[PDB]
Write a protein that binds this ligand. Structure first.
Ligand SMILES: NC(=O)C[C@H]1C[C@@H](C2=CN[C@@](Cc3ccccc3)(C[C@H](O)[C@H](Cc3ccccc3)NC(=O)O[C@H]3CCOC3)C2=O)c2ccccc21
Lengths: 99, 99
């Protein structure tokens, strides 16, 4: 589909069998979700944001559906204002910017 | 053009007689640029995300050129780690997300 930007590009994602609202964020290299439970082991990851660098938990090879499109990749979990879908997953679903 | 998301979607912008590199961010409501001088009045504002909040100066009705596309809108100026072109200006150049 084609998404205009007059409002926030919020979509429904599915992870761990549950639906959540998330933002398609081209300015984010990675995907960071609000506190939740994910399977497997995690590793430390430092990410830079508008207000500084913070520590988050990194889970790899996680199944996540974005607006119906299935993806499997790295998902970070930490104190984020909203669920952020970054470039790592946007590329998996074939998303591009156009103008 | 069609911009891939394999890398950060960076573009050249023209504002206040100077060329700058900026990140096209669908995840940002507004546009925020690193410290620079702009004409006209301004009002203080706080924007927050990963890492916390930063204080910025809000200038309205600012002329900007993004990839040869002219647009006018509010531009925030402050200690942002990178220049960010948000939805308020992305819409004006007809930028959309496609997948
Ligand atoms: N009101 C608003 O729209 C949000 C505020 C804050 C800031 C904001 C928008 N989106 C985000 C997320 C957000 C936060 C609150 C509400 C909606 C979305 C992320 C933004 O794209 C940064 C961009 C970035 C910052 C520093 C370095 C490099 C890129 N990327 C980023 O942190 O990537 C990291 C996290 C995942 O991968 C790594 C962000 O922090 C923002 C920017 C301009 C105007 C207003 C705002």
């Amino acid at each position: 589909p084609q998404i205009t930007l007059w409002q926030r590009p919020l979509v429904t994602i599915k992870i761990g069998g549950q639906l959540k609202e998330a933002l398609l964020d081209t300015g984010a290299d990675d995907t960071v979700l609000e506190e939740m439970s994910l399977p497997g082991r995690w590793k430390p990851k430092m990410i830079g944001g508008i207000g500084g660098f913070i520590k988050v938990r990194q889970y790899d090879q996680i199944l996540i559906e974005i607006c119906g499109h299935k993806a499997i990749g790295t998902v970070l979990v930490g104190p984020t204002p909203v669920n952020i879908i970054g470039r790592n997953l946007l590329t998996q679903i074939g998303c591009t910017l156009n103008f």
